[PDB]
């Protein structure tokens, strides 16, 4: 009875399949893939952020030169300068007039915002998708368990053992190269660590926040201070993190395909509705009811009464139930034409009980399996009027 089932990847709607175990009473499913969070394999390549030209205070030798050296600070720009007369609080102070030397030095450093407000590149591989699958199973009526997709993983949470996927729809909405910012995720071809052109994205490129080493192509060019005054002309491109916040591109949670949402959290891409998942469950046999205890319902009749050719469960149909015992009777349309809101219907001794459903074909000729009794609920449906609210329960469009 290990109920294999191909199953559409779509998040917010149950998939009430039916266990046709030969010998005992069938049992309905209710498989709602409440989430499709993905979490691909990734690598933190480098944080970037806007620089801060945290200038070390220049040297001023008063009569003669002060040769600079290339200190190992990131992008340590330093250039000796002569021909000053530095006004500092008493007019000038160095008594020479051309031998007055000024050595300006400036290096690039991570902002304090780099720790917290920072873009973040990644080389993104495929990884392994997940889900908090609820099944309000059978008469168990509950399990809300986190699972995987790889087609040999069980998750014995509740009582049922369930194996999912691998899904066929391998579209990772993440591209190979991704930039990430706070919550807005950008599938951007970041240039690389160690290379980013100044002004362009990644002018600062630190491996992480702690990493004292980095790559700072900022085109930081010191110029001589003017007219014998102490200061430090640092001529520099404002960061490619400054832009990339107001001349950027749009976020993947606003431009992705096939229906995904995003988080700066394990780097999941939630709820990506695409393709199918070959899902298979091993039910606990204890949860089964033996066949000789559920009422046999045959010699019945089914008919629509007001079929709504729609998404919400507007389709209805009375069923002239013709039972033997009285009790519950799980139901399902093995044809995917009709999706039913009721998993189970209570029965007195051969009464009648309408259920709700939804279809996509004008003439819904769908079988209905009322606990081992098939029936065609043939009829005709009506279009609605009022179509602006969230996503459907029908999801069965085909040739009609």
């Amino acid at each position: 009875y290990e109920h294999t089932a191909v199953m559409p990847n779509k998040v917010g709607i149950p998939y009430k399949a039916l266990v046709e175990r030969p010998g005992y009473a069938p049992v309905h499913l209710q498989i709602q893939l409440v989430n499709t969070r993905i979490i691909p394999s990734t690598n933190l390549e480098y944080i970037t952020c806007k620089y801060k030209t945290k200038v070390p205070s220049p040297v001023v030798k008063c009569c003669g030169a002060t040769q600079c050296t290339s200190k190992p600070h990131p992008d340590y720009q330093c250039q000796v300068f002569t021909g000053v007369y530095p006004f500092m609080w008493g007019g000038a102070y160095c008594f020479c007039d051309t031998e007055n030397t000024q050595m300006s030095e400036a290096y690039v450093e991570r902002s304090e915002e780099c720790s917290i407000d920072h873009a973040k590149a990644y080389k993104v591989h495929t990884g392994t998708v997940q889900a908090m699958v609820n099944i309000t199973y059978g008469s168990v009526s509950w399990r809300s368990a986190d699972v995987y997709v790889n087609g040999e993983t069980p998750a014995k949470i509740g009582d049922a053992k369930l194996i999912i996927g691998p899904l066929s729809s391998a579209w990772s909405p993440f591209d190979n190269k991704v930039v990430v910012y706070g919550h807005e995720v950008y599938n951007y071809d970041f240039p690389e660590y160690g290379t980013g052109k100044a002004g362009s994205f990644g002018d600062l490129q630190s491996r992480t926040s702690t990493s004292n080493d980095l790559y700072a192509n900022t085109n930081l060019k010191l110029q001589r201070p003017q007219a014998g005054i102490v200061h430090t002309p640092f001529t520099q491109a404002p960061s490619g993190f400054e832009r990339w916040k107001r001349d950027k591109g749009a976020p993947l949670n606003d431009v992705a395909p096939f229906g995904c949402s995003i988080a700066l959290e394990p780097l999941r891409a939630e709820n990506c509705a695409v393709g199918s998942i070959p899902i298979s469950i091993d039910i606990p046999d204890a949860a089964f009811t033996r066949i000789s205890e559920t009422p046999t319902v045959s010699d019945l009749e089914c008919k629509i009464t007001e079929c709504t050719y729609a998404s919400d469960f507007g389709g209805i149909a009375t069923v002239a139930y013709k039972s033997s015992k009285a009790g519950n009777c799980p139901i399902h349309s093995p044809s995917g034409v009709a999706v039913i809101k009721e998993n189970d219907v209570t029965l007195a001794e051969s009464g009648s009980f309408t259920f709700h459903f939804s279809t996509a074909n004008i003439h819904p000729a769908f079988k209905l399996q009322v606990c081992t009794s098939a029936v065609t609920c043939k009829g005709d449906c009506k279009p609605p009027k009022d179509h602006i609210v969230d996503y459907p329960a029908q999801h069965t469009e085909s040739f009609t």
Binding site: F258, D386, H387
Partner: protein
């Protein structure tokens, strides 16, 4: 304590959202046609504008500023 743009005027058409819209400030609107064809849109809106969106069968979503994202069945 942060921003919020005035609510939209939702208007139905056949697989199409007319939206007479009227913000306070320039608002970046954007959408995601949830087909594997994404077909998104972006436009800062500061001038009030009646816009349009060819919604598909499976759904679209709609982001009136930092107001939360909406979603829509257009069968």
């Amino acid at each position: 304590i942060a921003t919020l743009a005035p609510e939209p005027l939702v208007e139905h058409k056949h697989r199409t959202l007319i939206l007479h819209l009227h913000p306070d400030h320039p608002t970046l609107l954007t959408t995601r046609s949830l087909g594997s064809d994404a077909n998104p849109t972006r436009q800062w809106i500061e001038r009030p504008t009646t816009v349009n969106f060819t919604v598909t069968g499976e759904g679209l979503e709609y982001t009136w500023g930092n107001h939360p994202p909406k979603r829509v069945w257009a069968q």
